[PDB]
C-alpha cells in the first residue's frame, strides 16, 4: 500500500543540436522516495556517466514500477556500491519480501545498521528476483523449507490498544511458547 522507496524508470536525453538532432535516449531504473527525488538522481548519473547535465538535457518520461505479484514471496538479490569511512566497496545482498520495494527498504536499513552507511552513500547497481535454488546467502536459504516450523521465542506483551493500558495490574504476565 505505502512504501518508503519507490522504483521509477526515468527517460531523458541531451537537448537536440544542429550536429545531433536525434541524441541518444537514456533510461535508468532508480529508487527514490518520490518522483522529484528520482529525477534529481537521474541527472546525477547522466552528468557523471554520460556527461549530460540537466541544464543541457531533456526529461522525456518518468513512470513508477509496481510489483507484479505483491501477494507472493520472492527472493531479491541486490548488487550495490557504497562508501565507507575510508573508501568504496561492492557487496551483494539477498532479501525475502512480497515486493522489491520492501526488499530495498530492508537493504537501506541493514546498511545503516551493520555499516553506518547513510542513504546518500549507496548506489544500487543491479536488482533481480533470484529463484530459491540460486540463492547464495544462508539467511535466505534456511527459509526454503516446505516444513518450516519454529516457535515464537520472543513475544511482545501489550494490550490491543492503549485504551486497555493500566499502570498497575494484580498479576504478572503469563507467557508460554
Amino acid at each position: 500500500v505505502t512504501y518508503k522507496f519507490h522504483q521509477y524508470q526515468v527517460v531523458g536525453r541531451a537537448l537536440p543540436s544542429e550536429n545531433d538532432e536525434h541524441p541518444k535516449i537514456y533510461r535508468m531504473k532508480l529508487w527514490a522516495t518520490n518522483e522529484v527525488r528520482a529525477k534529481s538522481k537521474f541527472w546525477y548519473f547522466l552528468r557523471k556517466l554520460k556527461k549530460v547535465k540537466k541544464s543541457n538535457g531533456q526529461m522525456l518520461a518518468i513512470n513508477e514500477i509496481f510489483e507484479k505479484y505483491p501477494t507472493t514471496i520472492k527472493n531479491y538479490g541486490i548488487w550495490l556500491r557504497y562508501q565507507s569511512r575510508t573508501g568504496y566497496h561492492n557487496m551483494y545482498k539477498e532479501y525475502r519480501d512480497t515486493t522489491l520495494n520492501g526488499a530495498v527498504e530492508q537493504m537501506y536499513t541493514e546498511m545503516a545498521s551493520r555499516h553506518r552507511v547513510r542513504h546518500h552513500c549507496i548506489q544500487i547497481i543491479k536488482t533481480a528476483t533470484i529463484p530459491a535454488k540460486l540463492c547464495k546467502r544462508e539467511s535466505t536459504k534456511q527459509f526454503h523449507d516446505s516444513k518450516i516450523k519454529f516457535p515464537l521465542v520472543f513475544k511482545k506483551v501489550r494490550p490491543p490498544s492503549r485504551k486497555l493500558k493500566t499502570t498497575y495490574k494484580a498479576t504478572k504476565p503469563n507467557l508460554f511458547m
Binding site: 522516495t33 518520490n34 518522483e35 522529484v36 527525488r37 534529481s40
Partner: protein, 48 residues
C-alpha cells in the same frame, strides 16, 4: 500577468499545519528548501 500579479499583495500564509521536515536541507535531501514541483500544492493546503 505582470499587472495582475503585482496587484496581488504578497500572501500572508500561516505556519504549516503538521510542520516542516528540515528547513536547512534541500527538498531533494529530505528537507524543505528548493523546487518541489507539484508537491508545493501539498504544502499550500497545510499553510493556507
Amino acid at each position: 500577468f505582470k499587472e495582475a500579479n503585482n496587484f496581488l499583495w504578497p500572501f500572508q500564509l500561516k505556519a504549516p499545519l503538521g510542520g516542516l521536515k528540515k528547513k536547512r536541507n534541500h527538498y531533494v535531501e529530505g528537507g524543505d528548501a528548493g523546487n518541489r514541483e507539484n508537491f508545493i500544492n501539498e504544502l499550500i493546503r497545510r499553510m493556507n
